[PDB]
Design a protein around this ligand. Structure first.
Ligand SMILES: Nc1ncnc2c1ncn2[C@@H]1O[C@H](COP(=O)(O)OP(=O)(O)O)[C@@H](O)[C@H]1O
Lengths: 238, 232, 242, 42, 239, 240, 248, 240, 38, 253
C-alpha cells in the first residue's frame, strides 16, 4: 500500500523514499529530449522542439534560454515551473553581479537555483512559495574561471557535473548513446555533430531546422543560440 | 447525503448546509421558552426546572438584560447563550458609545445575528447551538425578534421554541390576539409554559422577564409567585 | 483498541481517555530504567544507559542533564524528546532567574515544565513528549525534593522513584530499602546495586551505570558522581551482586 | 506483439508490402494510450 | 486519488487538477484570433440571447489597454477577475516605466498570475484561456495564447474554446502569407474560420479588429452583415 | 446516527456534541471522587486520596488548591488538566484583581473560567480540558457560595455538590440530606460531607486518606484542614 | 468524488460546489423584476408569513442599497444580509471616492467579484444568494441586472429567480413586449406572473412584495407598494381576469 | 489498514513508536556508505562517492562548514544541504559574537534541537539525513553521528549508509588500534572499512572515495582524486 | 474476572505442586488477574 | 492434516523457556490429568502465544504436534476475516468437529486475526462459545498463536479459552546464532565459518530471516561456482536477505 505515502511531500515511505519527489523526477520524462555535452572548447546544448502545430511561432517554445551572457540553459519539464526557475536563476546572477561585480560561476548558479528548489518542504513558504517539488530538470552550461562547465539540476535540487548529460522523454537512450560516443578531447565541432547524431537517432520526427534549437558557449564568445542559417550549415553535414 | 453533513463550508447537492440544521436540532432540544408581544409591552418566559434541588437557582439566570430596555432569552445550550449575552452586551455598548443613544432593538438583532452567522462562515468552528428571543421597546412600539444559529433573524408576535415548540406555537396561535394586554400576555406565556412543563411550576421553576415603556426588567420571584397564584 | 480515536491527541475515547497520552506512556515503559532517591540532605540519580554498540564513546547520549546549577535532570524515553524537554526547562529556569532574581524552586520548575508538556498534549498539530523525566534539587532553606513528570503532564512528588521497563520491579526492590535516614554516601551504593539487579543480562545486555547527585556535599550543586565515588559504588555493586 | 500486429495492419491498409516507421508510430498511438501533455510540458 | 489535489503529482507525473482546469476551457465558447501584416482580429462565437439578456454586458472581447486586447473562453467570472487584474497591471506598468505595455509583458503577467493561482491548495486555478492580441509601440503584430496552467505561447492565428481543434485545422489548411496581405483578406480568413463551427453566420459572431494604433473599434452590427455578404459573394464566386 | 463523535466542533444529528460528553466521562476517568457542602456561613470541600505506595510524597499529591487568599478550589479528572485549570484560574483571578481593584467573586470566576471552557469547546483547536471544577468562597451580602464548572462551560450554584466516579450516588445521598431542611452548622457540614463520602465508598476511611478545605465568614481565608483537625472532626463523627 | 471544497475541478471541468450553489436558489422565494419604458419594479414573494410575524420591516426580499439602488434577494438569509451590507459598503465607498452615485454595472461587478473570490480560493463556501439589482444612471437610464451565486451577472429586461423561476421566465418571455411597457403594464404583467408561478388560486397582497423605482424631476424615488396600493393592484388584476374569462 | 499510524510524526503507534520517525531513520540507509575515525589529535571523514552515471562527476558527500568542523552527509540531498547551511550560519554567528569556534558538542546539540522540531510538530518532514560530524576543540577530536530521529551519539567511529554494518563490524574488530594511529594509519583503517562495505567486484578508486581530515594544527580539508592519490599510494591490497 | 481469579489460583496451586490452595495463592492469582485486567 | 510434522525440538532453537511452557501447558496436564482432578480443577483448554512475525510460532506448534503425535490443523487468521458472513459457526465449528475422532489432536490458530467490522465480531463470538463448549477429557487442544499483543479480547484472553500465554521474544544474539546453526546442519558447511560473528551481524533479524540468510548463503555458494566451504557467502547473505534488491535511487546524497 504505497498510496498513504503517495499523498503529500512530507511523508516518508517504509523504504524511506520521497514518493512525491520521485513523481516530480518522473515528470521530466514528459519533456522533450535535451542534450548537453562538455568539451574543452566549450559546451553545446541541443533540444527537441516537439512542435504541436506548424502555425505555432517557434520562438515562443523556449527550450534553451539565456541566464547570462556567459551561461546557457536547457530545460525539460513543466513550462511554468521552469519559467520561475529561469527567472530566479537570472535574478540571482544579477544579484551576484551587483554585490560582487563579477561573473558568477555556473556551479554557483546551479547552487542558487537548487536553493530555490528543494524548498517545497520548508516553512519559509508562508508569504507564498512552492508546496510541491519543482517538476522541471535543468541543464546548465557555460564558461567560468574553471573553463567551460556543464551542470545538470535534479528536480529534488541535486546537481552534478556531467561531461555529457541528456534529459527529457528520452534520457535513457540518449544517455546510453552518449556513454560510448563521448570522448574527453572531443572538439566542439565534432561534439555538435555527435549531439545532432544522437538527436536524429532518438527523435520521433525527422531532423530539420524547426525540430531542434541549438546553443553553444565557448570561452571566447558569449552565449550563442544557433540561428536558422547556422542550423542549416550544421545540419547539412549530418 | 452523509458526506455533506460534516462540514460548514460544503453545500449538500440537493439543499444547503446540514450542520446548520443540526445546530437547529440542538436548539429544538433545549429548555422550552416562549415570548409574547402585547399591545403595550413584551414578555418572555422560560422554565428553569432542573433536578437536584441542591442547584442554586439564583446563581444563574436564563433571562438577562442587554441594556436598559432590551432583554433576551435562549432555548438550547447554556454556555453558548452566555457567550451570546456577552457579545450582545458588547455590541450594544459599542453602539451606545458611538451614537450616544440607546441602541434600537432592530439594530441589536441585526448585529447579534451577524455575530452568530460569523461562526458559520468557516469550518473548524461550530455554529451556536442557541436560538435567541429578543424583547425590546422603543419608538413607542414593543418589538420581539428571534435570532437563529444560521444568522437569520425575524420578528415574532408570539412564539415558543425549545422542547415541545410545536404545541406551544399551536397554543399561542389559538390564544394570542393583537389587542392583548401585558398582564394577560404574561398569563398566556405562563400557561404556554404550563401545558408542557411536566411538574407544577413553582415561583423559581420558571423565569420570566417583561419589557415596556419603562424598560426591560426580569420579574422578581415574588411577582412570579403572585402571577402563578392568579393563574393557579 | 480505540481505533478512530487515537489518531489525534485532542480526541477523547468513549471510555473518556486520550489514547495518544497512553501511547506515550507505553513508549516510556518500553525504554531504559532510571531511578532517583532523595537522601537526608540532597537527591541522587541513577540511569541504566544501554551502550548499543561498543563503537560509541563512553558518556555518549548523556542522560543526566543539569537544568540549573542546583537542579538535576534524569530522563527516560526518547533521547531527542528528552533533550528538547531539558532545553525548554533550562530556558524556563533562566527566565525565572532573570525575572525574579533568585533560584527557581524545584516544585515551581516542575509545575512549569509539567504545564508545558501538558500544553504539548492537548493539541492536534503537535505530539506529546514521549519521555518521562525526573527533577531533583537541594536548598538549605527549602530542603530536598524529587519530582517525576511523565508525558501525561502529571507532576507528583516521589520519595524515590523509577521509570522504564523495570518500573514495578524497581518499585518492589526500593520498597524494602528504608530511605528517609541516611545521606548520599549510604544511598549511592544502594542505588548502584538496585540498578545492577533490575538490569537483565540474558536479554538487553551491555549497559553502563552513571550517577549524579545534588546536595550540601557539593554545596547544593548538581554534578556527576566523582570518579572515585563512582568506582567505589561500582565495587559495592559487584560485591553485593556477588 | 499487438503493436507489431497493428503496424502490419496499418501497412496492409495502405496496400504496401513493407511496413514503415510511420506505421509503427500509428500502431503504438492506437494500442498504447488505449494537447494536455504538449501544452504544459515541453 | 491523485485527481483531487492541485499540488500533488500523479505517479505518471501529472498535475491532474491543472489539466482539469485546462479542459474546463473546452466547455466555453469558440474564440479565434488572427494577426496580419497590419491588422489583428478577434473572432468569437456569440451566444444567442434568448429574449431579454442585454448584449452590452455579455462582453467576450475586452481591451486591457489601448495597445492590447484579448478574448477569453472557459469561465466568465474568472475571466472578469483576470481582466480587471490585467488592466490594473497595465496601468501600473505604465506608471512604473511610462511606456505602453508590450503584448509580451501583459501576456507574461497574466500567465504568471494564473500560475501563482495554480501552485497551492485553497486556490482554484483560473479556468479560462486567453488570446492576447495587440501591437507593441514599435508597431509589430503579436498574438499570444495563455493557458489555465499558467503558460503562454505565441501563435499567428489560434482558436480556443469548444471546437477549437477544428478551427485550428482550418487555419493550418488556410493560413497563407498572401492570406494576410490586406485587412479584408484577414477578415475573410477569420470569418471563414468562425463559420467552420458557427455555420449560421450573421449573428452569433463578434469581431474586433486592430490596425496600427487607432484605439480599436469592435465591428458594430452594421458591417458584420456586410462582411458576411462579401464572404458569401466570394464563396459563390469561386464556386 | 453515529460517526460524528470525532471532532469537538461537529454537530451530530439531533444536535448532540459527543466529544463534550466524552470529556465528561474523562472526568470520571480520574478514578477519584469529591463532594462539597455549604452551610449558613461555611463551605466545606473534601476529596478522596488514593496512594498506590508510600513511595509518594503525600504532601504534594493534593487535589484541592488555593485560587486566591480567600477562594478555594478542588477538582477531579485528569490531574494535569486540573493543574492547568487551576493555573488558568489563578491567572484570571489576579488579572481581575488588577483590572477592577477588588477580589474576584466566586460566581464571576466560575463564569469566566466556564467562558474559557466554552471557547475551547467551540473551536476545534483545543482539547476541552476534561476536568471538573469546584470553587468555594465567601461574598458579602450573599454569604458562602459553592460553584461547579465543567468542560462544557456550564457553571451553576450548588447548596451541595459532588464530582468523580460516584457522582450519581453522592448526589442522591446529598439530595436525601438536603430535603430534610436543616441549618448545616460548620461541624455538621463537615460531618455530612464525610458521611457522604464514606457511605458512597463504603470504606469507613482512615483519617489519612482525606484532605479537607473550608471557608467561613469568620475565617474568609481558604484554610486547608490539617491532619490534626481532620482527625478531630472524623474521629468525633465516628464516636458521635 | 469531486464534491469536496469548492476549490476543486471535476474531470469534465465542472465546479460542483458552484453548481449546487446554483441549484440551491430554486428553494428560495420567487422574485422577479421587469424593465419598463419609464420605470422599473421588483416583484417578490413572501414565502414565509405563518400567522404571527410582526411585519416590522420595509422589505425583506427587496433591499435598498443607495438613493439610486435597490435589489431583491433570494438565498440563505445570512449570506443575504452579508451581501446586502457589502453592497451598501461598496456603494457608499464609491460615493465617497467619486462624489457620484455608483453605476449599476460597477456595483454589480464589485459584488460579483466578491462572490467569485468566495469561490475562487480560500476553502470557503460560495454565497448561495442570487440578486436582482434595480437602479438608474445617466449612463444607461433604467437597468435591471440578475446576479448569480457563481459570481456571474447579466443585464435583463425581465427575469425571475426563485422557485418555479423557469416557468415564470418562460411565460414572461412569451408575454413581453419590449420597448412598449409602462409602469402600469409592467405591474399587471408582474401580478399575472406571480399568479401563474405561485401555489395559490388567489394570491394575497401579503404574500406579494413589490417595490418600484422611478426617476422623475431630477431625482430617483424608490418606493415599495403600500398595502392599499398593492391590494388595489391585485383587485384590478382579478377583475381584469374575470373580464377575460367571461369574454371567453 | 493497520498501518494508519504512519502518516505523520504527530501520531504514536499503539506500541508506543513513531513509525514515520523510524522511516526517516531507515531513509539514510539508502545513502552511500561513509565512515569516520579519530586519533589523539586527528579526526578523519572518508566517504564513498557515488555517481549517477560514469559520464557525470561523483556526488560530493563531504561538506566543509568551518575550518575546525566538517561534516559528511548520507541521506536526502535537500535536508543534508539545509542542515549544512544551518551549521554554516551557526558557526559564522559564533565566530562573530564570541570570536571562538563552536565546540562540536554544542554544534551537534543545536543540530539535535533544530531537527527535533520536525520530529515533534506537524508540518516540516523530519530531517531524513544521517550526518557524520568531525571537528576540533579543547577536549580534542570528536566524531558525532546525528541520527534523523534528532538523536546523536559520541562515537570513536561510525558508519552510516548502505551496507554500513560490515564497516561497523570492521571498526569493532580493529577497535584496539584507532586511538594510537597517526594520520596514515587511521586513514588506512578508514579506507579498509570503506573497502569492506564495498562489494568484491568494486574497489576504492580515486574517483570513488573522498577524504576529509581535521586535526590540531591542520584545518578540515577535503581531499579528491588527485589529493587522495598519496593516501591510496600506501594502501595494501584487498584481502581477497 | 473473579472466576478467573479462582481458576488461576487453582493453576497456581500446581506451579508449586500442591493438591490444595493457600491464601497467598489466592492473593497472587487475583494480582495476576488484576494485571491482565489493566 | 500433515499428520507427520517431523520435529524433535532440535528444529526449534532459542525458545527453550517457550517450549517448556508449551509442554507444561498442553502435554503435562494431558498425562497428569489425574493430578488435575485430584485438585478439583479443570485442565487448560488451550494455549496462547504472541510475538513478531517469523519468530517461530508455527514451528513450535508443529514441534508440539510431533512430540505429542497429535493431529495438526493450520487454521489461518487473515483468511477468516474474508469469505463473507458465515466464517463463524460454519468453518471454525467444522475445523473443531471432525478433528475429535482421529483424536490425538492439536488444532492451531495462527497470525493474530482481528481479535462493517461485524463479521469479525461473529467470528470471535463463535470462537468463544465453541471453545468454551469444549471436551471434558480435553483430548483435543487448541494452540492460538498470534502476531501482536495490541489487540486483545478479554472474553478470549480469560481463563479456559486462552489463559496460557507465551511471549515469543526476538532472538537476542545467541538465539540468532542458534537459529543460524539449526538452519545450517544439512549443508556441508566447514568449521572455518564463524556463526557467532554472523549472529552479532543479525541485529533486527527475526527468525525466518536467519533461515533466509542460510538459504541465500547456500545460493551464492553455488553462485561463486559451487565453492563449498565458505563464510564470506554467509556474510553477503547477511547483507542482502529481504533487502537483496539494491535501490539505486537518485536524489540521495
Ligand atoms: N528459533 C528458531 N529456530 C529455528 N527456526 C526458526 C526459529 N524461529 C523461526 N524459525 C523459522 O521461521 C519459520 C517459522 O516462522 P513462524 O514465526 O512460525 O511463522 P509465522 O510468524 O507466520 O506464524 C520456520 O521456517 C522456522 O524455521
Amino acid at each position: 500500500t504505497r498510496s498513504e505515502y503517495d499523498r503529500g511531500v512530507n511523508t516518508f515511505s517504509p523504504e524511506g523514499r520521497l514518493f512525491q519527489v520521485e513523481y516530480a523526477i518522473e515528470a521530466i520524462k514528459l519533456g522533450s529530449t535535451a542534450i548537453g555535452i562538455q568539451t574543452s572548447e566549450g559546451v553545446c546544448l541541443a533540444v527537441e522542439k516537439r512542435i504541436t502545430s506548424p502555425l505555432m511561432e517557434p520562438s515562443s517554445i523556449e527550450k534553451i534560454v539565456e541566464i547570462d551572457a556567459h551561461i546557457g540553459c536547457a530545460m525539460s519539464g513543466l513550462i511554468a515551473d521552469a519559467k520561475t526557475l529561469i527567472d530566479k536563476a537570472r535574478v540571482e546572477t544579477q544579484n551576484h553581479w551587483f554585490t560582487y561585480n563579477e561573473t558568477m560561476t555556473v556551479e554557483s548558479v546551479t547552487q542558487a537555483v537548487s536553493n530555490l528548489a528543494l524548498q517545497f518542504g520548508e516553512e519559509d513558504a508562508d508569504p507564498g512559495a512552492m508546496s510541491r517539488p519543482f517538476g522541471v530538470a535543468l541543464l546548465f552550461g557555460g564558461v567560468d574561471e574553471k573553463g567551460p562547465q556543464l551542470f545538470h539540476m535534479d528536480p529534488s535540487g541535486t546537481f552534478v557535473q556531467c561531461d555529457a548529460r541528456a534529459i527529457g522523454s528520452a534520457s535513457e537512450g540518449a544517455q546510453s548513446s552518449l556513454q560510448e560516443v563521448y570522448h574527453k578531447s572531443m572538439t566542439l565541432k565534432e561534439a555538435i555533430k555527435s549531439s545532432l547524431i544522437i538527436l536524429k537517432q532518438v527523435m520521433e520526427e525527422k531532423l530539420n531546422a524547426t525540430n531542434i534549437e541549438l546553443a553553444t558557449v565557448q570561452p571566447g564568445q558569449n552565449f550563442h543560440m544557433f540561428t536558422k542559417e547556422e542550423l542549416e550549415e550544421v545540419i547539412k553535414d549530418i | 447525503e452523509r458526506g455533506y453533513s460534516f462540514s460548514l463550508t460544503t453545500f449538500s447537492p440537493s439543499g444547503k448546509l446540514v450542520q446548520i440544521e443540526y445546530a437547529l436540532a440542538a436548539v429544538a432540544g433545549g429548555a422550552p421558552s416562549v415570548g409574547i408581544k402585547a399591545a403595550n409591552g413584551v414578555v418572555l418566559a422560560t422554565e428553569k426546572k432542573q433536578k437536584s434541588i441542591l442547584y442554586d437557582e439564583r446563581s444563574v439566570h436564563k433571562v438577562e438584560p442587554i441594556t436598559k430596555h432590551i432583554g433576551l432569552v435562549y432555548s438550547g445550550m447554556g454556555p453558548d447563550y452566555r457567550v451570546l449575552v456577552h457579545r450582545a452586551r458588547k455590541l450594544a455598548q459599542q453602539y451606545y458609545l458611538v451614537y450616544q443613544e440607546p441602541i434600537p432593538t432592530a439594530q441589536l438583532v441585526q448585529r447579534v445575528a451577524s455575530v452568530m452567522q460569523e461562526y458559520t462562515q468557516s469550518g473548524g468552528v461550530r455554529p451556536f447551538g442557541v436560538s435567541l428571543l429578543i424583547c425590546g421597546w422603543n419608538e413607542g412600539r414593543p418589538y420581539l425578534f428571534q435570532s437563529d444559529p444560521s444568522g437569520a433573524y425575524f420578528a415574532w408576535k408570539a412564539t415558543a421554541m425549545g422542547k415541545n415548540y410545536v404545541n406551544g406555537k399551536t397554543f399561542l396561535e389559538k390564544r394570542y390576539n393583537e389587542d392583548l394586554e401585558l398582564e394577560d400576555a404574561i398569563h398566556t406565556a405562563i400557561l404556554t409554559l404550563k401545558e408542557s412543563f411536566e411538574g407544577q411550576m413553582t415561583e423559581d421553576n420558571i423565569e420570566v422577564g417583561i419589557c415596556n415603556e419603562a424598560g426591560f426588567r426580569r420579574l422578581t420571584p415574588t411577582e412570579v409567585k403572585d402571577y402563578l397564584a392568579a393563574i393557579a | 483498541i480505540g481505533t478512530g480515536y487515537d489518531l489525534s491527541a485532542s480526541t477523547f475515547s468513549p471510555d473518556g481517555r486520550v489514547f495518544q497520552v497512553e501511547y506515550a506512556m507505553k513508549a516510556v515503559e518500553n525504554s531504559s530504567t532510571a531511578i532517583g532517591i532523595r537522601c537526608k540532605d540532597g537527591v541522587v540519580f541513577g540511569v541504566e544507559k544501554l551502550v548499543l554498540s561498543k563503537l560509541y564513546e563512553e558518556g555518549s547520549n548523556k542522560r543526566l542533564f543539569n537544568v540549573d546549577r542546583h537542579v538535576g535532570m534524569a530522563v527516560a524515553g526518547l533521547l531527542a524528546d528528552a533533550r528538547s524537554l531539558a532545553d525548554i526547562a533550562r530556558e524556563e529556569a533562566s527566565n525565572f532567574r532573570s525575572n525574579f532574581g533568585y533560584n527557581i524552586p524545584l516544585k515551581h520548575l516542575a509545575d512549569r515544565v509539567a504545564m508545558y508538556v501538558h500544553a504539548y498534549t492537548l493539541y492536534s498539530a503537535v505530539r506529546p513528549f514521549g519521555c518521562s523525566f525526573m527533577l531533583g534539587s537541594y536548598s538549605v532553606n527549602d530542603g530536598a525534593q524529587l519530582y517525576m513528570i511523565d508525558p501525561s503532564g502529571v507532576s507528583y512528588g516521589y520519595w524515590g522513584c523509577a521509570i522504564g521497563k523495570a518500573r514495578q520491579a524497581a518499585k518492589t526492590e526500593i520498597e524494602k530499602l528504608q530511605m528517609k535516614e541516611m545521606t548520599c554516601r549510604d544511598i549511592v551504593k544502594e542505588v548502584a546495586k538496585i540498578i545492577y539487579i533490575v538490569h537483565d543480562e540474558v536479554k538487553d545486555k551491555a549497559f553502563e551505570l552513571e550517577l549524579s547527585w545534588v546536595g550540601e556535599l557539593t554545596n547544593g550543586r548538581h554534578e556527576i558522581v566523582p570518579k572515585d565515588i563512582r568506582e567505589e559504588a561500582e565495587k559495592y555493586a559487584k560485591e553485593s551482586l556477588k | 506483439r499487438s503493436v507489431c500486429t497493428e503496424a502490419g495492419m496499418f501497412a496492409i491498409r495502405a496496400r504496401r508490402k513493407i511496413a514503415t516507421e510511420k506505421d509503427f508510430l500509428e500502431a503504438v498511438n492506437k494500442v498504447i494510450k488505449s494537447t494536455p501533455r504538449y501544452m504544459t510540458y515541453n | 486519488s491523485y485527481d483531487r489535489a492541485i499540488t500533488v503529482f500523479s505517479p505518471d507525473g501529472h498535475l491532474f487538477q491543472v489539466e482539469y482546469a485546462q479542459e474546463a476551457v473546452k466547455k466555453g465558447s469558440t474564440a479565434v484570433g488572427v494577426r496580419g501584416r497590419d491588422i489583428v482580429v478577434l473572432g468569437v462565437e456569440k451566444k444567442s440571447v434568448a429574449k431579454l439578456q442585454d448584449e452590452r454586458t455579455v462582453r467576450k472581447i475586452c481591451a486591457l489597454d489601448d495597445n492590447v486586447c484579448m478574448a477569453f473562453a472557459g469561465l466568465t467570472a474568472d475571466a472578469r477577475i483576470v481582466i480587471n487584474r490585467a488592466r490594473v497591471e497595465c496601468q501600473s506598468h505604465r506608471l512604473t516605466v511610462e511606456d505602453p505595455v508590450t503584448v509580451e509583458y501583459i501576456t507574461r503577467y497574466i500567465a504568471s498570475l494564473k500560475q501563482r493561482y495554480t501552485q497551492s491548495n485553497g486556490r482554484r486555478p483560473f479556468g479560462i484561456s486567453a488570446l492576447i492580441v495587440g501591437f507593441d509601440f514599435d508597431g509589430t503584430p503579436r498574438l499570444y495564447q495563455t493557458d489555465p496552467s499558467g503558460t503562454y505561447h505565441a501563435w499567428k492565428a489560434n482558436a480556443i474554446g469548444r471546437g477549437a481543434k477544428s478551427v485550428r485545422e482550418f487555419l493550418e489548411k488556410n493560413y497563407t502569407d498572401e492570406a494576410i496581405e490586406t485587412d479584408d483578406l484577414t477578415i475573410k480568413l477569420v470569418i471563414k474560420a468562425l463559420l467552420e463551427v458557427v455555420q449560421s453566420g450573421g449573428k452569433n459572431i463578434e469581431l474586433a479588429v486592430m490596425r496600427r494604433d487607432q484605439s480599436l473599434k469592435i465591428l458594430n452590427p452594421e458591417e458584420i452583415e456586410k462582411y458576411v455578404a462579401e464572404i458569401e459573394k466570394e464563396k459563390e464566386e469561386n464556386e | 446516527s453515529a460517526g460524528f463523535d470525532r471532532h469537538i466542533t461537529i454537530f451530530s444529528p439531533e444536535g448532540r456534541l459527543y466529544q463534550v460528553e466524552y470529556a465528561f466521562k474523562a472526568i470520571n476517568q480520574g478514578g477519584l471522587t469529591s463532594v462539597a457542602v455549604r452551610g449558613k456561613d461555611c463551605a466545606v470541600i473534601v476529596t478522596q486520596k488514593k496512594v498506590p505506595d508510600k513511595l509518594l510524597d503525600s504532601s504534594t499529591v493534593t487535589h484541592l488548591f488555593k485560587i486566591t487568599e480567600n477562594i478555594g478550589c478542588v477538582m477531579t479528572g485528569m490531574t494535569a488538566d486540573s493543574r492547568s485549570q487551576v493555573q488558568r484560574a489563578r491567572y484570571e483571578a489576579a488579572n481581575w484583581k488588577y483590572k477592577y481593584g477588588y477580589e474576584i467573586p466566586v460566581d464571576m470566576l466560575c463564569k469566566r473560567i466556564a467562558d474559557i471552557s466554552q471557547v475551547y469547546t467551540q473551536n476545534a483547536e483545543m482539547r476541552p480540558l476534561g476536568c471538573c471544577m469546584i470553587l468555594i468562597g465567601i461574598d458579602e451580602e450573599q454569604g458562602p457560595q459553592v460553584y461547579k464548572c465543567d468542560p462544557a462551560g456550564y457553571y451553576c450554584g450548588f447548596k451541595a455538590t459532588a464530582a468523580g466516579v460516584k457522582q450519581t450516588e453522592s448526589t442522591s445521598f446529598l439530595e436525601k440530606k438536603v430535603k430534610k431542611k436543616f441549618d448545616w452548622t460548620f461541624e455538621q457540614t463537615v460531618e455530612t460531607a464525610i458521611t457522604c463520602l464514606s457511605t458512597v465508598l463504603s470504606i469507613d476511611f482512615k483519617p489519612s486518606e482525606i484532605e479537607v478545605g473550608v471557608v467561613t465568614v469568620e475565617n474568609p481565608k481558604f484554610r486547608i484542614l490539617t491532619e490534626a483537625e481532620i482527625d478531630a472532626h472524623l474521629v468525633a463523627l465516628a464516636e458521635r | 468524488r469531486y464534491d469536496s471544497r469548492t476549490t476543486i475541478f471535476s474531470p469534465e471541468g465542472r465546479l460542483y460546489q458552484v453548481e449546487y450553489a446554483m441549484e440551491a436558489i430554486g428553494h428560495a422565494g420567487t422574485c422577479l423584476g421587469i424593465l419598463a419604458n419609464d420605470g422599473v419594479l421588483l416583484a417578490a414573494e413572501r414565502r414565509n408569513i405563518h400567522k404571527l410575524l410582526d411585519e416590522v420591516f420595509f422589505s425583506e426580499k427587496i433591499y435598498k442599497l443607495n438613493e439610486d439602488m435597490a435589489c431583491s434577494v433570494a438565498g440563505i438569509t445570512s449570506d443575504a444580509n452579508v451581501l446586502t451590507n457589502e453592497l451598501r459598503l461598496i456603494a457608499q465607498r464609491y460615493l465617497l471616492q467619486y462624489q457620484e452615485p455608483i453605476p449599476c454595472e460597477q456595483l454589480v461587478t464589485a459584488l460579483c467579484d466578491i462572490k467569485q473570490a468566495y469561490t475562487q480560493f480560500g476553502g470557503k463556501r460560495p454565497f448561495g444568494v442570487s440578486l436582482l439589482y434595480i437602479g438608474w444612471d445617466k449612463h444607461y437610464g433604467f437597468q435591471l441586472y440578475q446576479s448569480d451565486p457563481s459570481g456571474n451577472y447579466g443585464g435583463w429586461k425581465a427575469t425571475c429567480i426563485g422557485n418555479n423561476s423557469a416557468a415564470a421566465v418562460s411565460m414572461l418571455k412569451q408575454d413581453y413586449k419590449e420597448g412598449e411597457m409602462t409602469l402600469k403594464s409592467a405591474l399587471a404583467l408582474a401580478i399575472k406572473v406571480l399568479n401563474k408561478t405561485m401555489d395559490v388560486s388567489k394570491l394575497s397582497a401579503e404574500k406579494v412584495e413589490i417595490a418600484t423605482l422611478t426617476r422623475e424631476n431630477g431625482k430617483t424615488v424608490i418606493r415599495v407598494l403600500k398595502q392599499k396600493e398593492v391590494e388595489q393592484l391585485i383587485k384590478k388584476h382579478e377583475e381584469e381576469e374575470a373580464k377575460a374569462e367571461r369574454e371567453k | 489498514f493497520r498501518n494508519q499510524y504512519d502518516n505523520d510524526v504527530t501520531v504514536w503507534s499503539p506500541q508506543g513508536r513513531i513509525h514515520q520517525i523510524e522511516y526517516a531513520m531507515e531513509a539514510v540507509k539508502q545513502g552511500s556508505a561513509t565512515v569516520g575515525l579519530k586519533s589523539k589529535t586527528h579526526a578523519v571523514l572518508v566517504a564513498l562517492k557515488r555517481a549517477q552515471s560514469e559520464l557525470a562527476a561523483h556526488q560530493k558527500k563531504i561538506l566543509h562548514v568551518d575550518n575546525h568542523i566538517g561534516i559528511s552527509i548520507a541521506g536526502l540531498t535537500a535536508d543534508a544541504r539545509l542542515l549544512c547551511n544551518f551549521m554554516r550560519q551557526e558557526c559564522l554567528d559564533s565566530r562573530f559574537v564570541f570570536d571562538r569556534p563552536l565546540p562540536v558538542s554544542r554544534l551537534v546539540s543545536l543540530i539535535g534541537s533544530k531537527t527535533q522540531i520536525p520530529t515533534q510538530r506537524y508540518g516540516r518532514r523530519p530531517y531524513g539525513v544521517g550526518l557524520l560530524i568531525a571537528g576540533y576543540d579543547d577536549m580534542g577530536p570528536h566524531i558525532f553521528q546525528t541520527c534523523p530521529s534528532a538523536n546523536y551519539f559520541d562515537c570513536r567511529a561510525m558508519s552510516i549508509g548502505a551496507r554500513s554494518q560490515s564497516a561497523r563490524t570492521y571498526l569493532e574488530r580493529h577497535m584496539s588500534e584507532f586511538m594510537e594511529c597517526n594520520l596514515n594509519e587511521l586513514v588506512k583503517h578508514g579506507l579498509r572499512a570503506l573497502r569492506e562495505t564495498l562489494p568484491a567486484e568494486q574497489d576504492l578508486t580515486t574517483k570513488n572515495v573522498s577524504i576529509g581530515i581535521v586535526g590540531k594544527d591542520l584545518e578540515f580539508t577535503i581531499y579528491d582524486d588527485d589529493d587522495v592519490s598519496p593516501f591510496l599510494e600506501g594502501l595494501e591490497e584487498r584481502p581477497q | 474476572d473473579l472466576r478467573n481469579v479462582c481458576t488461576e489460583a487453582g493453576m497456581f496451586a500446581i506451579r508449586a505442586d500442591h493438591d490444595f490452595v493457600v491464601q497467598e495463592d489466592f492473593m497472587k492469582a487475583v494480582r495476576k488477574v488484576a494485571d491482565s485486567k489493566k | 492434516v500433515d499428520e507427520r510434522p517431523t520435529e524433535q525440538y532440535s528444529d526449534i532453537g532459542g525458545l527453550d523457556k517457550q517450549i517448556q511452557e508449551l509442554v507444561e501447558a498442553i502435554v503435562l496436564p494431558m498425562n497428569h490429568k489425574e493430578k488435575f482432578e485430584n485438585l478439583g480443577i479443570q485442565p487448560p483448554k488451550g494455549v496462547l502465544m504472541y510475538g513478531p512475525p517469523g519468530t517461530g510460532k508455527t514451528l513450535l506448534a508443529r514441534a508440539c504436534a510431533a512430540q505429542t503425535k497429535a493431529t495438526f490443523l493450520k487454521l489461518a487468521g487473515p483468511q477468516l476475516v474474508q469469505m463473507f458472513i458465515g466464517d463463524g459457526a460454519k468453518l471454525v465449528r467444522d475445523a473443531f468437529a471432525l478433528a475429535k475422532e482421529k483424536a490425538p489432536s492439536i488444532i492451531f490458530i495462527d497470525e493474530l486475526d482481528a481479535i462493517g467490522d461485524r463479521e469479525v465480531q461473529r467470528t470471535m463470538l463463535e470462537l468463544l462459545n465453541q471453545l468454551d463448549g469444549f471436551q471434558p477429557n480435553t483430548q483435543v487442544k487448541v494452540i492460538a498463536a498470534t502476531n501482536r499483543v495490541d489487540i486483545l479480547d478479554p472474553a478470549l484472553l480469560r481463563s479456559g479459552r486462552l489463559d496460557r500465554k507465551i511471549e515469543f521474544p526476538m532472538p537476542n544474539e545467541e538465539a540468532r546464532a542458534r537459529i543460524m546453526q539449526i538452519h545450517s546442519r544439512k549443508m556441508n558447511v566447514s568449521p572455518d565459518v564463524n556463526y557467532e560473528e554472523l549472529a552479532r551481524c543479525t541485529d533486527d533479524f527475526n527468525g525466518a530471516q536467519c533461515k533466509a540468510v542460510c538459504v541465500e548463503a547456500g545460493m551464492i555458494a553455488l553462485r561463486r561456482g559451487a565453492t563449498e566451504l565458505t563464510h564470506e557467502d554467509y556474510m553477503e547473505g547477511i547483507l542482502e536477505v529481504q533487502a537483496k534488491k539494491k535501490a539505486n535511487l537518485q536524489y540521495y546524497a
